[PDB]
Tab-separated table of C-alpha atoms and ligand atoms in Angstrom:
chain	number	residue	atom	x	y	z
A	1	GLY	CA	-21.972	-25.088	-27.170
A	2	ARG	CA	-19.925	-22.471	-25.982
A	3	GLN	CA	-17.935	-23.196	-22.835
A	4	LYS	CA	-17.855	-21.704	-19.594
A	5	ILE	CA	-15.623	-20.630	-16.723
A	6	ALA	CA	-16.635	-19.967	-13.434
A	7	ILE	CA	-14.132	-18.083	-11.331
A	8	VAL	CA	-14.647	-18.388	-7.148
A	9	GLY	CA	-13.454	-15.077	-5.565
A	10	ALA	CA	-13.660	-11.589	-6.755
A	11	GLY	CA	-10.282	-10.636	-4.919
A	12	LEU	CA	-7.583	-8.888	-6.700
A	13	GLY	CA	-6.607	-12.168	-8.499
A	14	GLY	CA	-10.096	-13.347	-9.493
A	15	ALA	CA	-10.819	-10.193	-10.847
A	16	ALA	CA	-7.797	-9.816	-12.841
A	17	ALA	CA	-8.427	-13.550	-14.333
A	18	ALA	CA	-12.111	-12.630	-15.107
A	19	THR	CA	-11.045	-9.460	-16.886
A	20	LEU	CA	-8.082	-11.005	-18.743
A	21	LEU	CA	-10.022	-14.199	-19.714
A	22	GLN	CA	-13.353	-12.226	-21.011
A	23	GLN	CA	-10.874	-9.779	-23.132
A	24	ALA	CA	-9.483	-12.937	-24.467
A	25	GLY	CA	-13.112	-13.824	-25.667
A	26	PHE	CA	-14.079	-16.351	-23.410
A	27	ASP	CA	-17.307	-16.673	-21.267
A	28	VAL	CA	-16.849	-16.061	-17.498
A	29	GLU	CA	-18.797	-15.572	-14.587
A	30	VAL	CA	-17.326	-14.599	-11.112
A	31	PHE	CA	-18.689	-15.935	-7.789
A	32	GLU	CA	-18.076	-13.843	-4.709
A	33	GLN	CA	-18.793	-14.732	-0.901
A	34	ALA	CA	-18.883	-11.098	0.519
A	35	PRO	CA	-22.603	-9.657	0.416
A	36	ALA	CA	-21.274	-6.398	-0.801
A	37	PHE	CA	-18.035	-4.977	-2.469
A	38	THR	CA	-15.900	-2.819	0.290
A	39	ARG	CA	-12.925	-0.607	-0.576
A	40	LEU	CA	-10.155	-1.771	1.886
A	41	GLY	CA	-8.823	1.322	3.331
A	42	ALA	CA	-5.146	0.012	2.912
A	43	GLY	CA	-2.341	0.965	0.328
A	44	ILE	CA	-0.748	-1.900	-1.809
A	45	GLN	CA	2.777	-2.131	-3.982
A	46	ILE	CA	2.312	-2.774	-7.552
A	47	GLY	CA	5.576	-3.461	-9.260
A	48	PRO	CA	6.482	-2.982	-13.110
A	49	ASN	CA	6.118	-6.636	-13.675
A	50	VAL	CA	2.611	-6.338	-12.998
A	51	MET	CA	2.024	-2.859	-14.632
A	52	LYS	CA	2.688	-4.468	-17.636
A	53	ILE	CA	-0.370	-6.845	-16.967
A	54	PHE	CA	-2.491	-4.070	-16.121
A	55	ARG	CA	-1.483	-2.562	-19.383
A	56	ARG	CA	-3.143	-5.538	-21.109
A	57	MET	CA	-6.168	-5.086	-19.363
A	58	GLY	CA	-6.368	-1.202	-20.442
A	59	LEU	CA	-5.536	-0.028	-16.642
A	60	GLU	CA	-2.309	0.835	-16.738
A	61	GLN	CA	-2.624	4.780	-17.467
A	62	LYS	CA	-5.386	5.081	-15.001
A	63	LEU	CA	-3.381	3.514	-12.056
A	64	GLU	CA	-0.495	6.036	-13.150
A	65	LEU	CA	-2.747	8.749	-12.506
A	66	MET	CA	-3.933	7.625	-9.275
A	67	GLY	CA	-0.970	6.097	-7.472
A	68	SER	CA	2.362	7.776	-6.016
A	69	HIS	CA	5.575	7.224	-8.038
A	70	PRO	CA	8.354	6.701	-5.441
A	71	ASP	CA	11.970	7.455	-6.483
A	72	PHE	CA	13.122	5.177	-4.127
A	73	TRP	CA	12.554	2.445	-1.797
A	74	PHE	CA	14.653	3.203	1.417
A	75	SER	CA	15.270	0.414	3.825
A	76	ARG	CA	16.164	2.091	7.290
A	77	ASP	CA	17.314	0.715	10.527
A	78	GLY	CA	14.449	0.860	13.148
A	79	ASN	CA	16.554	2.334	15.849
A	80	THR	CA	18.945	4.792	14.226
A	81	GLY	CA	17.465	5.536	10.907
A	82	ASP	CA	20.645	4.613	9.006
A	83	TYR	CA	20.093	3.973	5.613
A	84	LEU	CA	20.568	-0.095	4.805
A	85	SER	CA	19.482	0.558	1.267
A	86	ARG	CA	18.386	3.142	-1.402
A	87	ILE	CA	16.460	0.895	-4.510
A	88	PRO	CA	16.080	3.155	-7.288
A	89	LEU	CA	12.673	3.362	-8.648
A	90	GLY	CA	10.984	6.220	-10.287
A	91	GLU	CA	12.410	6.788	-13.662
A	92	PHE	CA	15.177	4.538	-13.562
A	93	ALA	CA	12.569	1.800	-13.177
A	94	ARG	CA	10.363	2.961	-16.073
A	95	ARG	CA	13.534	2.809	-18.237
A	96	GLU	CA	15.210	-0.336	-16.773
A	97	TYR	CA	12.223	-2.393	-16.268
A	98	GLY	CA	9.622	-1.098	-18.854
A	99	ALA	CA	7.041	0.527	-16.722
A	100	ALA	CA	6.201	2.439	-13.392
A	101	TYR	CA	6.502	0.932	-9.861
A	102	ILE	CA	3.826	2.378	-7.779
A	103	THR	CA	2.045	2.500	-4.567
A	104	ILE	CA	-1.697	3.143	-4.283
A	105	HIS	CA	-4.920	2.793	-2.760
A	106	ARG	CA	-5.940	-0.770	-2.632
A	107	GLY	CA	-9.535	-0.480	-2.263
A	108	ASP	CA	-9.792	1.972	-5.337
A	109	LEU	CA	-7.309	-0.348	-7.670
A	110	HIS	CA	-9.771	-3.208	-6.610
A	111	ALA	CA	-12.940	-1.381	-7.424
A	112	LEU	CA	-11.145	-0.087	-11.017
A	113	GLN	CA	-10.367	-4.106	-11.442
A	114	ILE	CA	-13.947	-5.399	-11.006
A	115	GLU	CA	-15.261	-2.477	-12.878
A	116	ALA	CA	-13.134	-3.926	-15.903
A	117	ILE	CA	-15.603	-6.956	-15.598
A	118	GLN	CA	-18.277	-7.470	-18.056
A	119	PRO	CA	-21.639	-5.992	-16.319
A	120	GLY	CA	-23.825	-8.662	-15.252
A	121	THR	CA	-21.038	-11.378	-14.616
A	122	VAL	CA	-19.863	-10.793	-11.194
A	123	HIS	CA	-22.042	-12.016	-8.510
A	124	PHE	CA	-22.086	-11.031	-4.941
A	125	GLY	CA	-23.560	-12.969	-1.919
A	126	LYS	CA	-22.419	-16.092	-3.601
A	127	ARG	CA	-20.335	-18.371	-1.166
A	128	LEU	CA	-19.380	-21.663	-2.690
A	129	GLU	CA	-19.897	-24.442	-0.046
A	130	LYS	CA	-19.462	-27.692	-2.299
A	131	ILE	CA	-17.881	-28.416	-5.556
A	132	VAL	CA	-17.899	-31.775	-7.656
A	133	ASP	CA	-15.898	-32.218	-10.882
A	134	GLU	CA	-18.401	-34.541	-12.489
A	135	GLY	CA	-15.960	-35.421	-15.100
A	136	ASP	CA	-17.213	-33.508	-17.974
A	137	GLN	CA	-18.342	-30.334	-16.020
A	138	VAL	CA	-18.346	-28.942	-12.487
A	139	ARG	CA	-21.122	-28.099	-10.489
A	140	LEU	CA	-21.021	-25.175	-7.946
A	141	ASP	CA	-23.379	-24.952	-4.745
A	142	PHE	CA	-23.315	-21.821	-2.855
A	143	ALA	CA	-24.544	-21.068	0.727
A	144	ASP	CA	-27.676	-19.567	-0.302
A	145	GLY	CA	-28.953	-22.585	-1.889
A	146	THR	CA	-28.449	-21.771	-5.728
A	147	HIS	CA	-26.038	-23.057	-8.130
A	148	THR	CA	-24.213	-22.963	-11.205
A	149	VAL	CA	-22.576	-25.416	-13.931
A	150	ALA	CA	-19.081	-24.480	-15.779
A	151	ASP	CA	-16.805	-26.450	-18.066
A	152	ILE	CA	-13.698	-25.079	-15.704
A	153	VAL	CA	-13.474	-23.589	-12.159
A	154	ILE	CA	-10.876	-21.470	-11.051
A	155	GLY	CA	-10.178	-20.982	-7.473
A	156	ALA	CA	-9.261	-17.478	-6.939
A	157	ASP	CA	-10.711	-17.708	-3.197
A	158	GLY	CA	-7.613	-16.800	-1.230
A	159	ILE	CA	-5.620	-18.705	1.659
A	160	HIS	CA	-9.064	-20.221	2.906
A	161	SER	CA	-9.683	-21.535	-0.546
A	162	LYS	CA	-13.005	-23.930	-0.737
A	163	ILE	CA	-11.551	-25.375	-4.062
A	164	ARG	CA	-8.436	-26.237	-2.428
A	165	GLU	CA	-10.276	-27.977	0.554
A	166	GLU	CA	-12.585	-29.879	-2.138
A	167	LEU	CA	-9.222	-31.065	-3.545
A	168	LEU	CA	-7.186	-31.943	-0.533
A	169	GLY	CA	-9.748	-32.077	2.283
A	170	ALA	CA	-9.791	-30.107	5.298
A	171	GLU	CA	-6.490	-28.333	5.968
A	172	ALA	CA	-4.401	-28.978	9.343
A	173	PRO	CA	-4.809	-26.201	12.011
A	174	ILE	CA	-2.278	-23.128	11.536
A	175	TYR	CA	-1.797	-20.860	14.075
A	176	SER	CA	-0.697	-16.995	13.989
A	177	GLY	CA	1.897	-15.841	16.262
A	178	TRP	CA	2.354	-12.663	14.250
A	179	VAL	CA	0.209	-9.517	13.158
A	180	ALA	CA	0.161	-6.561	10.740
A	181	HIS	CA	-1.034	-3.319	12.069
A	182	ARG	CA	-2.419	-1.048	9.335
A	183	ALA	CA	-3.573	2.559	9.476
A	184	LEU	CA	-4.171	5.525	7.120
A	185	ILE	CA	-2.922	8.715	8.322
A	186	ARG	CA	-4.232	12.218	6.838
A	187	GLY	CA	-4.540	15.522	8.014
A	188	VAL	CA	-2.316	18.514	9.657
A	189	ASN	CA	-1.107	15.249	11.582
A	190	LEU	CA	0.337	14.311	7.895
A	191	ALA	CA	1.206	17.868	6.844
A	192	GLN	CA	3.175	18.505	10.139
A	193	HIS	CA	5.592	15.972	9.746
A	194	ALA	CA	5.541	15.849	5.664
A	195	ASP	CA	9.451	16.761	5.511
A	196	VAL	CA	10.539	13.631	6.989
A	197	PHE	CA	7.908	11.079	5.459
A	198	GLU	CA	9.650	9.443	2.633
A	199	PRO	CA	7.469	8.115	-0.112
A	200	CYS	CA	8.391	4.319	0.473
A	201	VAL	CA	10.141	3.045	3.210
A	202	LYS	CA	10.411	-0.031	5.346
A	203	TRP	CA	12.019	0.591	8.952
A	204	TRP	CA	13.327	-2.511	10.120
A	205	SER	CA	14.714	-4.123	13.373
A	206	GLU	CA	15.590	-7.575	14.510
A	207	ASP	CA	12.227	-9.306	15.009
A	208	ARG	CA	9.590	-6.839	13.527
A	209	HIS	CA	9.126	-3.865	11.025
A	210	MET	CA	7.068	-1.172	9.572
A	211	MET	CA	6.378	-0.583	5.914
A	212	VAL	CA	5.100	3.317	5.002
A	213	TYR	CA	4.179	4.758	1.706
A	214	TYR	CA	1.907	6.936	0.325
A	215	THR	CA	-1.066	5.968	-1.602
A	216	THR	CA	-1.798	8.704	-3.926
A	217	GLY	CA	0.406	11.033	-6.124
A	218	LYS	CA	-1.188	13.960	-4.166
A	219	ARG	CA	0.487	12.403	-1.323
A	220	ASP	CA	-2.182	13.392	1.306
A	221	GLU	CA	-2.688	10.086	2.421
A	222	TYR	CA	0.190	7.915	4.251
A	223	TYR	CA	-0.309	4.413	4.907
A	224	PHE	CA	1.902	2.051	7.142
A	225	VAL	CA	1.453	-1.711	7.708
A	226	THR	CA	4.020	-3.799	10.007
A	227	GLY	CA	4.725	-7.040	10.773
A	228	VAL	CA	4.989	-8.167	14.646
A	229	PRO	CA	5.160	-10.902	17.013
A	230	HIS	CA	1.905	-11.265	18.622
A	231	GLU	CA	-0.002	-13.702	20.969
A	232	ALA	CA	-2.321	-16.501	18.783
A	233	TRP	CA	-5.199	-15.006	17.285
A	234	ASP	CA	-8.610	-15.974	18.729
A	235	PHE	CA	-10.854	-13.393	17.452
A	236	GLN	CA	-13.994	-13.955	15.290
A	237	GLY	CA	-12.997	-11.202	13.179
A	238	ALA	CA	-10.351	-11.015	10.111
A	239	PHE	CA	-9.398	-7.713	12.246
A	240	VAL	CA	-9.314	-5.889	15.201
A	241	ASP	CA	-9.047	-2.531	16.603
A	242	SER	CA	-5.489	-1.576	17.909
A	243	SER	CA	-4.404	1.426	19.675
A	244	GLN	CA	-1.590	3.888	19.942
A	245	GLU	CA	-0.411	2.438	23.265
A	246	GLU	CA	-0.468	-1.045	21.749
A	247	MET	CA	1.766	0.227	18.894
A	248	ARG	CA	3.927	2.475	21.161
A	249	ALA	CA	4.845	-0.380	23.115
A	250	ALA	CA	5.794	-2.600	20.082
A	251	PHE	CA	7.936	0.153	18.461
A	252	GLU	CA	9.624	0.979	21.848
A	253	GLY	CA	13.184	2.095	20.762
A	254	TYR	CA	12.440	3.335	17.064
A	255	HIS	CA	13.233	6.313	15.285
A	256	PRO	CA	11.438	9.434	16.049
A	257	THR	CA	9.834	9.672	12.384
A	258	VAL	CA	8.113	6.082	13.531
A	259	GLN	CA	7.096	7.445	16.844
A	260	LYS	CA	5.381	10.528	14.771
A	261	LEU	CA	3.530	8.264	12.684
A	262	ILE	CA	1.850	6.240	15.540
A	263	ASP	CA	1.289	9.538	17.183
A	264	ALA	CA	-0.586	10.660	14.172
A	265	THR	CA	-2.994	7.803	13.733
A	266	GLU	CA	-6.566	7.958	14.497
A	267	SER	CA	-7.703	4.502	13.924
A	268	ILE	CA	-5.439	1.361	13.474
A	269	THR	CA	-6.400	-2.300	12.885
A	270	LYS	CA	-4.635	-5.527	13.695
A	271	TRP	CA	-4.726	-8.501	11.360
A	272	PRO	CA	-3.326	-12.095	12.041
A	273	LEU	CA	-0.392	-13.621	10.006
A	274	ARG	CA	-0.220	-17.437	9.551
A	275	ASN	CA	3.019	-19.244	11.426
A	276	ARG	CA	3.037	-21.774	7.992
A	277	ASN	CA	1.549	-22.352	4.654
A	278	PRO	CA	1.088	-25.631	2.700
A	279	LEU	CA	2.634	-26.478	-0.371
A	280	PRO	CA	1.470	-25.078	-3.938
A	281	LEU	CA	-1.169	-26.811	-5.745
A	282	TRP	CA	-1.573	-25.658	-9.249
A	283	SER	CA	-4.687	-27.602	-10.538
A	284	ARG	CA	-6.794	-31.025	-10.537
A	285	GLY	CA	-8.949	-32.342	-13.454
A	286	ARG	CA	-11.519	-29.385	-14.497
A	287	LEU	CA	-10.142	-27.112	-11.388
A	288	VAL	CA	-7.449	-24.896	-11.560
A	289	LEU	CA	-5.920	-22.420	-8.561
A	290	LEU	CA	-4.285	-18.940	-8.583
A	291	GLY	CA	-3.007	-16.368	-5.935
A	292	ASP	CA	-3.204	-17.288	-2.306
A	293	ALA	CA	-5.440	-20.561	-3.099
A	294	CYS	CA	-2.511	-22.104	-5.095
A	295	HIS	CA	0.966	-20.772	-3.249
A	296	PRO	CA	0.120	-19.221	-0.225
A	297	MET	CA	3.038	-17.670	1.300
A	298	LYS	CA	4.068	-15.272	3.998
A	299	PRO	CA	4.101	-11.578	3.322
A	300	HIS	CA	7.933	-10.940	3.660
A	301	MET	CA	8.247	-9.628	0.052
A	302	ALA	CA	4.838	-8.135	-0.432
A	303	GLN	CA	4.316	-9.559	-3.924
A	304	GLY	CA	1.495	-11.862	-3.132
A	305	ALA	CA	-1.100	-9.942	-5.098
A	306	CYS	CA	1.437	-9.129	-7.999
A	307	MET	CA	1.842	-13.116	-7.987
A	308	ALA	CA	-1.761	-13.677	-8.337
A	309	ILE	CA	-1.846	-11.346	-11.265
A	310	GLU	CA	1.072	-12.953	-12.906
A	311	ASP	CA	-1.216	-16.136	-12.399
A	312	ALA	CA	-3.800	-14.812	-13.880
A	313	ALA	CA	-1.989	-13.594	-17.056
A	314	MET	CA	-0.054	-16.738	-17.689
A	315	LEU	CA	-3.403	-19.167	-17.187
A	316	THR	CA	-5.029	-16.566	-19.967
A	317	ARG	CA	-2.108	-17.084	-22.225
A	318	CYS	CA	-2.253	-21.001	-21.614
A	319	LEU	CA	-6.097	-21.144	-22.269
A	320	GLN	CA	-5.620	-18.958	-25.434
A	321	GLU	CA	-3.225	-21.505	-26.687
A	322	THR	CA	-5.248	-24.672	-26.070
A	323	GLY	CA	-8.748	-23.456	-25.782
A	324	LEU	CA	-10.989	-24.621	-23.183
A	325	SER	CA	-11.560	-28.083	-24.706
A	326	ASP	CA	-7.906	-28.995	-23.762
A	327	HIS	CA	-8.113	-27.763	-20.531
A	328	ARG	CA	-5.754	-30.350	-19.311
A	329	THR	CA	-2.808	-29.172	-21.508
A	330	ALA	CA	-3.668	-25.982	-20.507
A	331	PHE	CA	-3.422	-26.379	-16.838
A	332	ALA	CA	-0.040	-28.129	-17.083
A	333	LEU	CA	1.286	-25.367	-19.244
A	334	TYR	CA	0.351	-22.879	-16.716
A	335	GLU	CA	1.840	-24.826	-13.933
A	336	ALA	CA	5.126	-25.321	-16.097
A	337	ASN	CA	5.362	-21.753	-16.911
A	338	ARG	CA	4.872	-20.446	-13.299
A	339	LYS	CA	6.381	-22.943	-10.887
A	340	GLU	CA	9.810	-21.953	-10.983
A	341	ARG	CA	9.573	-18.241	-10.434
A	342	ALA	CA	6.636	-18.959	-7.546
A	343	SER	CA	9.708	-21.343	-6.031
A	344	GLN	CA	12.044	-18.369	-6.049
A	345	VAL	CA	9.637	-16.085	-4.713
A	346	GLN	CA	9.394	-18.654	-1.951
A	347	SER	CA	13.026	-18.916	-1.131
A	348	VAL	CA	13.633	-15.410	-1.132
A	349	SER	CA	10.651	-15.034	1.459
A	350	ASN	CA	12.132	-17.461	3.280
A	351	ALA	CA	15.466	-15.741	3.631
A	352	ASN	CA	13.346	-12.439	4.740
A	353	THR	CA	15.775	-9.801	3.676
A	354	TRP	CA	14.070	-8.469	0.655
A	355	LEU	CA	15.992	-5.217	0.060
A	356	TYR	CA	17.226	-4.844	3.434
A	357	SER	CA	20.715	-4.462	1.568
A	358	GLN	CA	21.574	-2.776	-1.701
A	359	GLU	CA	20.468	-5.787	-3.881
A	360	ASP	CA	19.458	-5.864	-7.663
A	361	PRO	CA	15.678	-6.406	-7.877
A	362	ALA	CA	15.674	-6.682	-11.648
A	363	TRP	CA	14.837	-10.481	-11.607
A	364	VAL	CA	11.206	-9.510	-9.995
A	365	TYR	CA	10.576	-5.949	-11.715
A	366	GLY	CA	12.046	-6.893	-15.074
A	367	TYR	CA	10.218	-10.076	-15.787
A	368	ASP	CA	8.505	-10.198	-18.977
A	369	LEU	CA	5.404	-12.328	-18.563
A	370	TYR	CA	4.092	-11.582	-22.216
A	371	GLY	CA	7.802	-12.242	-23.448
A	372	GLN	CA	7.944	-15.958	-22.081
A	373	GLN	CA	8.097	-18.843	-24.686
A	374	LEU	CA	5.135	-21.184	-23.191
A	375	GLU	CA	6.807	-24.334	-24.832
B	1	FAD	C1	0.379	-7.674	5.494
B	1	FAD	C2	0.474	-7.942	3.989
B	1	FAD	C3	0.906	-6.964	3.101
B	1	FAD	C4	0.751	-7.349	1.793
B	1	FAD	N1	1.357	-6.064	0.804
B	1	FAD	C5	1.202	-6.626	-0.393
B	1	FAD	C6	1.675	-5.656	-1.585
B	1	FAD	O1	2.310	-4.809	-1.419
B	1	FAD	N2	1.752	-6.017	-2.766
B	1	FAD	C7	1.042	-7.118	-3.192
B	1	FAD	O2	1.282	-7.807	-4.583
B	1	FAD	N3	0.527	-8.106	-2.147
B	1	FAD	C8	0.649	-7.772	-1.078
B	1	FAD	N4	0.464	-8.730	0.001
B	1	FAD	C9	-0.205	-10.046	-0.575
B	1	FAD	C10	-1.834	-9.841	-1.081
B	1	FAD	O3	-2.508	-9.351	-0.272
B	1	FAD	C11	-2.316	-11.162	-1.251
B	1	FAD	O4	-1.474	-12.162	-1.653
B	1	FAD	C12	-3.296	-11.186	-2.520
B	1	FAD	O5	-4.576	-10.515	-1.718
B	1	FAD	C13	-3.684	-12.439	-2.858
B	1	FAD	O6	-4.829	-12.505	-3.872
B	1	FAD	P1	-6.018	-13.576	-4.009
B	1	FAD	O7	-6.954	-12.877	-5.243
B	1	FAD	O8	-5.389	-14.887	-4.392
B	1	FAD	O9	-6.870	-13.703	-2.913
B	1	FAD	P2	-7.458	-12.801	-1.777
B	1	FAD	O10	-7.492	-11.399	-2.126
B	1	FAD	O11	-7.674	-13.580	-0.910
B	1	FAD	O12	-9.139	-12.744	-2.331
B	1	FAD	C14	-9.917	-14.105	-2.380
B	1	FAD	C15	-11.499	-13.512	-2.521
B	1	FAD	O13	-11.937	-14.951	-2.699
B	1	FAD	C16	-13.343	-14.779	-1.717
B	1	FAD	N5	-13.774	-16.105	-1.113
B	1	FAD	C17	-13.202	-16.916	-0.182
B	1	FAD	N6	-13.780	-17.940	-0.098
B	1	FAD	C18	-14.913	-18.057	-0.901
B	1	FAD	C19	-16.109	-18.570	-1.165
B	1	FAD	N7	-16.001	-19.953	-0.497
B	1	FAD	N8	-16.829	-18.759	-2.058
B	1	FAD	C20	-16.785	-17.202	-2.577
B	1	FAD	N9	-15.746	-16.399	-2.536
B	1	FAD	C21	-14.987	-16.886	-1.722
B	1	FAD	C22	-12.836	-13.912	-1.003
B	1	FAD	O14	-14.123	-13.240	0.177
B	1	FAD	C23	-11.788	-12.754	-1.473
B	1	FAD	O15	-12.703	-11.718	-2.179
B	1	FAD	C24	0.190	-8.517	1.162
B	1	FAD	C25	-0.280	-9.588	2.156
B	1	FAD	C26	-0.313	-8.960	3.490
B	1	FAD	C27	-0.607	-10.100	4.512
């Protein structure tokens, strides 16, 4: 008796799903390949639509205390500093969308999310190598020679998803012609230029950009992440070190505020971004996918983790409707209730002009996931 869910991947999507599903009364364990838990030294942006999901988890208030609450998102021209858009966030967002827009330290958010999972149910050092849906249950084999069995398996295992591979076979090669540079800035370097350093700003030019925001309400730590054309990635790491000289050449011509940020860094890392992504895969048999395993996308709108967390919330609602004994109905309802919004996000990402002009972002931030009728 008593049915079991195995989740592969303890990233933001897998850890959200584990929390929501356990809080709903399901029996859930999580299997993560990393040998240890790492707090990523990076920021992340979380819109009101996802703060409403952290609310269900009991984490919204804590995240509000930890994060920065920008009053606006500014899009600015990279060369001139002209204001291309002034998107109201802050108290306007709280009233209009029903929750805060925050920017926050991603590693600390991630730790808080894993700490909401029942102790004894998250297993590190478990890299899935083989999975077989035997028809009435699924067996999972890990690289350390252990295994586990479950009634359904959630593929929360990211763009390199092994669940996706077991279903579709080996994915065609995808190359990388662009990178994201990442840096955290603190210090007198930050204090010296605090008057010109706005809380949430995207600096744009013809073929590249730099996004910048604070990670905490103290505004003592300032983060940037870029998107920049780059030669094909052939390094073994998921990242490599970059340098100020690299960044200053890539951002030649940008406004003095951006040059000040580059000069203020101590350590920059570079991350490969894929040129292409496959079409969504939602479920097959006893396997269901969420987040970057399901609908990998270019990072143009920076809503990927938010979409993974929305997936987790909607999947939980659908399993609450059907129970685990009727997983095929749940998995069908999940896809039916997510695919159009995922497709709108895809189409707007393709245009790559999100908040470049003074547009109304309500369709993203005002979305009411728990209000949607599953039908
Ligand atoms: C430059 C950039 C900026 C971004 N900014 C934002 C932002 O501000 N806001 C936002 O919402 N999103 C943002 N995103 C998108 C976001 O990072 C991703 O969409 C999100 O991480 C997807 O979460 P996930 O849980 O689906 O996958 P992941 O975060 O990739 O997690 C997958 C997990 O599965 C594990 N795993 C993989 N293979 C296996 C295996 N075989 N066995 C076991 N475990 C395995 C991995 O180790 C990992 O822990 C950005 C992305 C980029 C590239």
